[PDB]
Amino acid sequence: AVPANPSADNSAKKVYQWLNGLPDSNGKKLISGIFGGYSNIGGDSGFSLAQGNAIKDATGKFPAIYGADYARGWDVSAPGDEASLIDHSCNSDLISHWKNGGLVAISHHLPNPFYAGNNPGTGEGGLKKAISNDEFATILQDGTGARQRWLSLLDKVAEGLQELRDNGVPVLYRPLHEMNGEWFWWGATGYNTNDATRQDLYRRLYQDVFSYFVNTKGLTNLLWVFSPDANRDHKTAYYPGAGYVDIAGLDFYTDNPASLSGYDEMLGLNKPFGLVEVGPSTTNGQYDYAVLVNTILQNFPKTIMFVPWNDGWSPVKNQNAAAAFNNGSVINLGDISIS
DSSP: OOOSSTTOOHHHHHHHHHHHHGGGOSSOOEEEEEEEEETTOOSTTBOSSHHHHHHHHHHSOOBSEEEEEEEETTSOOOTTOGGGGBOOTTHHHHHHHHHTTOEEEEEEEOOOTTSGGGOOSSSSOSTTOOOOHHHHHGGGSTTOHHHHHHHHHHHHHHHHHHHHHHTTOOEEEOOSOSTTSSSSTTSOSSSSOOOHHHHHHHHHHHHHHHHIIIIITOOTTEEEEEOOBTTSSOGGGGOOOTTSOSEEEEEEEOSSGGGOOSHHHHHTTOSOEEEEEEEOSSOSSOOBHHHHHHHHHHHOTTEEEEEEOSGGGSGGGSBOHHHHHHOTTEEBTTOOOOO
């Protein structure tokens, strides 16, 4: 099994190979992570090492994967300043993390390129502003204002991913996540609706990102994550195909960790599978993270990573983080051995 980009650099190739071996691995086989936050926002949700350091304090382990998100799609910008809503100053810490033997994961709550200023007259940014199939289609038509903002957004993401490339850092790159959910602009029109033409447009949009980044931007360091929402239907209806995807993901929020649906559907892709976003439904500090680690290990053994979200989803703000992260089968920072 080789990366989807035929030009994948050595660093990305050796990581992907190592990920492909872990379900067969006797000892450690389940990679830990945390979401460190959003690049360049204030307060607890902002990116820093704080999320990791709090887990080191609670568990004595630093998560193996540190996640950042480049974008604040919930905020409006000036029309023509849309790339202001993408920031990658998080990269400096992510590079130290790779250098200490951790892995880096990038998502982006992208602004909605259909709207100048990412401003649809809604009272906020267009992150969760739905658009029709006709409106969505304009993001893929040469010469449109939507396509121009789209590429401008992509350029500033690419800038950040290129810096990481130039420091020899492979990236678990998770674009256009939870696409089978009705909430994001890039996602479904409806709640569990089977819209073939939205499905086709999403596949086309993901493929647009893939070739832009693979050809034009020479982003050799990316392992492409396709992570639908575990609590919505038509999970693989949005799959762009084996040629576009390196890692199969689910975003999995629940009060009962055993209730995961989509597992065998997603194993069908024949890709390394991860719970690339994880936490409770109810943000009340009762979620048992040791239960999750055991439930994975016993019931979803092909699973090779778990990445809790930040805030009230963090193991720190919940139960038995220590037990979860010190499980004999868990890979934390310091535990990764690659040729």
